[PDB]
Design an enzyme around this catalytic site. Sequence first.
Site, PDB file in Angstrom:
ATOM      1  N   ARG A  91     -73.757  50.658  26.297  1.00 18.65           N
ATOM      2  CA  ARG A  91     -72.554  50.937  26.713  1.00 18.65           C
ATOM      3  C   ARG A  91     -71.534  50.240  25.878  1.00 18.65           C
ATOM      4  O   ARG A  91     -70.368  50.881  25.631  1.00 18.65           O
ATOM      5  CB  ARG A  91     -72.252  50.892  28.257  1.00 18.65           C
ATOM      6  CG  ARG A  91     -73.054  52.026  28.933  1.00 18.65           C
ATOM      7  CD  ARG A  91     -73.563  51.669  30.326  1.00 18.65           C
ATOM      8  NE  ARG A  91     -72.096  51.423  31.399  1.00 18.65           N
ATOM      9  CZ  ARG A  91     -71.981  50.772  32.232  1.00 18.65           C
ATOM     10  NH1 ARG A  91     -73.070  50.097  32.780  1.00 18.65           N
ATOM     11  NH2 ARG A  91     -70.791  50.637  33.003  1.00 18.65           N
ATOM     12  N   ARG A  97     -61.816  59.180  26.239  1.00 18.15           N
ATOM     13  CA  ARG A  97     -62.858  58.302  25.561  1.00 18.15           C
ATOM     14  C   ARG A  97     -63.109  58.246  24.054  1.00 18.15           C
ATOM     15  O   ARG A  97     -63.792  57.386  23.595  1.00 18.15           O
ATOM     16  CB  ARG A  97     -64.085  58.266  26.368  1.00 18.15           C
ATOM     17  CG  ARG A  97     -64.078  57.600  27.657  1.00 18.15           C
ATOM     18  CD  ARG A  97     -63.957  56.140  28.017  1.00 18.15           C
ATOM     19  NE  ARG A  97     -65.358  55.632  28.366  1.00 18.15           N
ATOM     20  CZ  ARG A  97     -65.938  55.538  29.600  1.00 18.15           C
ATOM     21  NH1 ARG A  97     -65.501  55.895  30.642  1.00 18.15           N
ATOM     22  NH2 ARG A  97     -67.083  54.866  29.463  1.00 18.15           N
ATOM     23  N   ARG A 152     -75.242  50.503  40.932  1.00 17.85           N
ATOM     24  CA  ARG A 152     -75.571  51.497  39.855  1.00 17.85           C
ATOM     25  C   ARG A 152     -76.637  51.233  38.978  1.00 17.85           C
ATOM     26  O   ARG A 152     -76.932  50.147  38.363  1.00 17.85           O
ATOM     27  CB  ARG A 152     -74.251  51.775  39.035  1.00 17.85           C
ATOM     28  CG  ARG A 152     -72.973  52.433  39.873  1.00 17.85           C
ATOM     29  CD  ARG A 152     -71.853  51.994  39.010  1.00 17.85           C
ATOM     30  NE  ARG A 152     -71.841  52.847  37.606  1.00 17.85           N
ATOM     31  CZ  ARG A 152     -70.653  52.893  36.893  1.00 17.85           C
ATOM     32  NH1 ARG A 152     -69.492  52.989  37.187  1.00 17.85           N
ATOM     33  NH2 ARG A 152     -70.821  53.163  35.634  1.00 17.85           N
ATOM     34  N   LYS A 187     -60.634  48.613  35.278  1.00 19.72           N
ATOM     35  CA  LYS A 187     -59.984  49.947  35.377  1.00 19.72           C
ATOM     36  C   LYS A 187     -59.814  50.630  36.906  1.00 19.72           C
ATOM     37  O   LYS A 187     -58.847  50.854  37.447  1.00 19.72           O
ATOM     38  CB  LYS A 187     -60.372  51.009  34.473  1.00 19.72           C
ATOM     39  CG  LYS A 187     -60.084  50.771  32.903  1.00 19.72           C
ATOM     40  CD  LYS A 187     -60.783  51.786  31.920  1.00 19.72           C
ATOM     41  CE  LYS A 187     -62.540  52.289  32.098  1.00 19.72           C
ATOM     42  NZ  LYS A 187     -63.285  50.988  31.869  1.00 19.72           N
ATOM     43  N   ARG A 228     -71.819  43.897  39.943  1.00 22.19           N
ATOM     44  CA  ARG A 228     -70.840  44.798  40.363  1.00 22.19           C
ATOM     45  C   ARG A 228     -71.741  45.647  41.541  1.00 22.19           C
ATOM     46  O   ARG A 228     -72.789  45.888  41.264  1.00 22.19           O
ATOM     47  CB  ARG A 228     -70.644  46.053  39.438  1.00 22.19           C
ATOM     48  CG  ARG A 228     -69.433  46.964  40.116  1.00 22.19           C
ATOM     49  CD  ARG A 228     -68.867  47.970  39.195  1.00 22.19           C
ATOM     50  NE  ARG A 228     -69.809  48.594  38.239  1.00 22.19           N
ATOM     51  CZ  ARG A 228     -69.217  49.267  37.005  1.00 22.19           C
ATOM     52  NH1 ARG A 228     -67.805  49.415  36.842  1.00 22.19           N
ATOM     53  NH2 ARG A 228     -69.990  49.960  36.151  1.00 22.19           N
TER      54      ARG A 228
HETATM   55  N1  LIG Z   1     -59.748  40.610  36.967  1.00 20.62           N
HETATM   56  C1  LIG Z   1     -61.081  40.501  37.505  1.00 20.62           C
HETATM   57  N2  LIG Z   1     -61.821  39.167  37.431  1.00 20.62           N
HETATM   58  C2  LIG Z   1     -63.049  39.184  38.078  1.00 20.62           C
HETATM   59  N3  LIG Z   1     -63.783  40.277  38.142  1.00 20.62           N
HETATM   60  C3  LIG Z   1     -63.222  41.449  38.283  1.00 20.62           C
HETATM   61  C4  LIG Z   1     -61.976  41.522  37.670  1.00 20.62           C
HETATM   62  N4  LIG Z   1     -61.650  43.054  37.906  1.00 20.62           N
HETATM   63  C5  LIG Z   1     -62.672  43.492  38.338  1.00 20.62           C
HETATM   64  N5  LIG Z   1     -63.675  42.697  38.662  1.00 20.62           N
HETATM   65  C6  LIG Z   1     -65.108  43.019  39.056  1.00 20.62           C
HETATM   66  O1  LIG Z   1     -65.777  43.128  37.893  1.00 20.62           O
HETATM   67  C7  LIG Z   1     -66.614  44.533  38.034  1.00 20.62           C
HETATM   68  C8  LIG Z   1     -65.805  45.556  37.157  1.00 20.62           C
HETATM   69  O2  LIG Z   1     -64.528  46.270  37.607  1.00 20.62           O
HETATM   70  P1  LIG Z   1     -64.387  47.679  37.477  1.00 20.62           P
HETATM   71  O3  LIG Z   1     -63.060  47.897  38.168  1.00 20.62           O
HETATM   72  O4  LIG Z   1     -65.631  48.594  38.254  1.00 20.62           O
HETATM   73  O5  LIG Z   1     -64.420  48.031  36.116  1.00 20.62           O
HETATM   74  P2  LIG Z   1     -64.471  49.187  35.140  1.00 20.62           P
HETATM   75  O6  LIG Z   1     -63.274  49.070  34.015  1.00 20.62           O
HETATM   76  O7  LIG Z   1     -63.706  50.520  36.022  1.00 20.62           O
HETATM   77  O8  LIG Z   1     -65.895  49.871  34.512  1.00 20.62           O
HETATM   78  P3  LIG Z   1     -66.894  51.152  34.652  1.00 20.62           P
HETATM   79  O9  LIG Z   1     -68.126  50.989  33.810  1.00 20.62           O
HETATM   80  O10 LIG Z   1     -66.556  52.245  35.480  1.00 20.62           O
HETATM   81  O11 LIG Z   1     -66.708  52.067  33.071  1.00 20.62           O
HETATM   82  P4  LIG Z   1     -67.911  52.787  32.310  1.00 20.62           P
HETATM   83  O12 LIG Z   1     -67.387  53.908  31.410  1.00 20.62           O
HETATM   84  O13 LIG Z   1     -69.090  52.041  31.934  1.00 20.62           O
HETATM   85  O14 LIG Z   1     -68.385  53.495  33.582  1.00 20.62           O
HETATM   86  P5  LIG Z   1     -67.688  54.883  33.493  1.00 20.62           P
HETATM   87  O15 LIG Z   1     -67.942  54.676  34.947  1.00 20.62           O
HETATM   88  O16 LIG Z   1     -66.278  55.299  33.389  1.00 20.62           O
HETATM   89  O17 LIG Z   1     -68.768  56.161  33.209  1.00 20.62           O
HETATM   90  C9  LIG Z   1     -70.186  56.073  33.325  1.00 20.62           C
HETATM   91  C10 LIG Z   1     -70.806  56.921  32.166  1.00 20.62           C
HETATM   92  O18 LIG Z   1     -70.455  58.105  32.277  1.00 20.62           O
HETATM   93  C11 LIG Z   1     -70.229  59.171  30.878  1.00 20.62           C
HETATM   94  N6  LIG Z   1     -68.662  59.249  30.687  1.00 20.62           N
HETATM   95  C12 LIG Z   1     -67.699  58.834  31.601  1.00 20.62           C
HETATM   96  N7  LIG Z   1     -66.371  59.053  31.274  1.00 20.62           N
HETATM   97  C13 LIG Z   1     -66.689  59.817  30.085  1.00 20.62           C
HETATM   98  C14 LIG Z   1     -65.951  60.534  28.905  1.00 20.62           C
HETATM   99  N8  LIG Z   1     -64.245  60.747  29.148  1.00 20.62           N
HETATM  100  N9  LIG Z   1     -66.325  61.285  28.034  1.00 20.62           N
HETATM  101  C15 LIG Z   1     -67.919  61.086  27.737  1.00 20.62           C
HETATM  102  N10 LIG Z   1     -68.649  60.512  28.593  1.00 20.62           N
HETATM  103  C16 LIG Z   1     -68.006  59.890  29.833  1.00 20.62           C
HETATM  104  C17 LIG Z   1     -70.704  57.908  30.044  1.00 20.62           C
HETATM  105  O19 LIG Z   1     -72.092  58.387  29.995  1.00 20.62           O
HETATM  106  C18 LIG Z   1     -70.705  56.646  30.684  1.00 20.62           C
HETATM  107  O20 LIG Z   1     -71.631  55.448  30.422  1.00 20.62           O
HETATM  108  C19 LIG Z   1     -66.523  44.776  39.548  1.00 20.62           C
HETATM  109  O21 LIG Z   1     -67.729  44.303  40.185  1.00 20.62           O
HETATM  110  C20 LIG Z   1     -65.473  44.141  39.740  1.00 20.62           C
HETATM  111  O22 LIG Z   1     -65.204  43.594  41.448  1.00 20.62           O
HETATM  112 MG   LIG Z   2     -65.086  53.658  37.056  1.00 20.13          MG
END
Ligand SMILES: Nc1ncnc2c1ncn2[C@@H]1O[C@H](COP(=O)(O)OP(=O)(O)OP(=O)(O)OP(=O)(O)OP(=O)(O)OC[C@H]2O[C@@H](n3cnc4c(N)ncnc43)[C@H](O)[C@@H]2O)[C@@H](O)[C@H]1O
Ligand SMILES: [Mg+2]
Length: 217
Positions: free
Chosen positions: A171, A88, A160, A13, A127
Site C-alpha cells: 500500500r 487517488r 482490518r 484522514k 489500528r
Molecule cells: N496525529 C496522530 N498521532 C498518532 N496516531 C494517530 C494520529 N492520527 C491518527 N492516528 C492513529 O493512526 C491510525 C491511522 O489513522 P487513520 O485516521 O485511520 O488514517 P487514514 O489516513 O484514514 O488511513 P486508511 O488506510 O483509511 O487509508 P487506505 O487507503 O490504506 O485505506 P483506504 O481505506 O482509503 O482504502 C482501502 C483500499 O480500498 C481501495 N481504494 C480506496 N479508495 C480508492 C480510490 N479512490 N481509487 C482506487 N482504489 C481505492 C484500495 O484498494 C485501498 O488500499 C489509527 O489507528 C489512528 O487512531
Molecule cells: Mg479511511
Amino acid sequence: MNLVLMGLPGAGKGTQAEKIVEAYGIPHISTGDMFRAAMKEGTPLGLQAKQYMDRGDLVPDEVTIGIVRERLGKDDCERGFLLDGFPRTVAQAEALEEILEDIGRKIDYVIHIDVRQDVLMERLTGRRICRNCGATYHLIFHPPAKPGVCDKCGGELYQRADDNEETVAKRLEVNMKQMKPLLDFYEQKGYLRNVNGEQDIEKVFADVRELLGGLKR
Ligand SMILES: Nc1ncnc2c1ncn2[C@@H]1O[C@H](COP(=O)(O)OP(=O)(O)OP(=O)(O)OP(=O)(O)OP(=O)(O)OC[C@H]2O[C@@H](n3cnc4c(N)ncnc43)[C@H](O)[C@@H]2O)[C@@H](O)[C@H]1O
Ligand SMILES: [Mg+2]
Ligand SMILES: [Zn+2]
C-alpha cells in the site's frame, strides 16, 4: 464547504474526518469505506474490489469514479461534502472536476495531511475500528475507554484484514507513486493547503479548524 482530504495510508484522514463531520454536519464520503461495505455484502462490485484491496493495489479508475458520481448527486450534498481518500490518481481528479462543474459544487480547499513513511507501519498495525459505526482507535496512540469497546456506540472493535505488515508495505509503495502528480495537479489550481500530520490528534484538528474558518457553515 466542498472539501477533499489527501494523504498517505495511516496519515490521519479518517480520524480528522470524524471531527470535521461532528463539528460542521456535512456528509462523509469515503471510497475505501464504500468498497469494504460492498465486499461484506457480497455484491459484484464488492467481490471485484476485494481482489485489489487484499493485495494492496488500487481499484481501477472508471468503476471508482462511477460510485462517486452517483453519491455526490444526492440531495444531502447540496450544502457541502467531505471526500476522504478520493481522488487517488490524476485521472480521478480530472473526472471529479467535470462532475462538479456539471452539478455546480466546485472545491473550496484540498487538505493534504502530510506524514513521512517511517512512522506509518506502527500506525497501521495497531489500528482498531468499530464493526458497527467505523469509529477509529489505536492501541498505543488513542485507546478506547474500555478495551475492545467503541466509546460512541458500544460496538466490538476489530483489526482490518489489509492492516498486516506485508499488505501495508505494498500500500505504501502504490500510493507513494501517486502523491507528487496529484499534489502538482492541485498546486497548479491554487487551493492545495498543507497540514503537519506529525503532531497530537487535538493539535492536528486545531490547525484544520484554522484552515477552514473562512468558509460559511
Ligand atoms: N496525529 C496522530 N498521532 C498518532 N496516531 C494517530 C494520529 N492520527 C491518527 N492516528 C492513529 O493512526 C491510525 C491511522 O489513522 P487513520 O485516521 O485511520 O488514517 P487514514 O489516513 O484514514 O488511513 P486508511 O488506510 O483509511 O487509508 P487506505 O487507503 O490504506 O485505506 P483506504 O481505506 O482509503 O482504502 C482501502 C483500499 O480500498 C481501495 N481504494 C480506496 N479508495 C480508492 C480510490 N479512490 N481509487 C482506487 N482504489 C481505492 C484500495 O484498494 C485501498 O488500499 C489509527 O489507528 C489512528 O487512531
Ligand atoms: Mg479511511
Ligand atoms: Zn461504534
